[PDB]
């Protein structure tokens, strides 16, 4: 699998174990559901760009133990 290291605001090493075949859409929502926040509230940043709902770990250049950031959106949701 692919372990994505998400940088939490409280400095947490969130290790998301994703599957190389599933769209990041299901991963993005699952992250929100786990933290107890609605989707569109947090933006996932990868290489400066933000992961879209139609993005897959196959593109961009995602690898094992990769680093991904998460920040709150200006809208809050």
């Amino acid at each position: 699998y692919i372990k994505l290291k998400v940088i939490g605001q409280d400095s947490s090493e969130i290790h998301f174990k994703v599957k190389m075949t599933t769209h990041l859409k299901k991963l993005k929502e699952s992250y929100c559901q786990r933290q107890g926040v609605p989707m569109n509230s947090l933006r996932f940043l990868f290489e400066g760009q933000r992961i879209a709902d139609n993005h897959t770990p196959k593109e961009l250049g995602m690898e094992e133990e990769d680093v991904i950031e998460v920040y709150q959106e200006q809208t809050g949701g």
Binding site: S12, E13, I14, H15, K17, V18, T22, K26, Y31
Partner: peptide
């Protein structure tokens, strides 16, 4: 350390 591994379920 504060690393937590998350495993989800792949479903359409």
């Amino acid at each position: 350390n504060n690393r937590d591994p998350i495993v989800i379920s792949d479903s359409p």
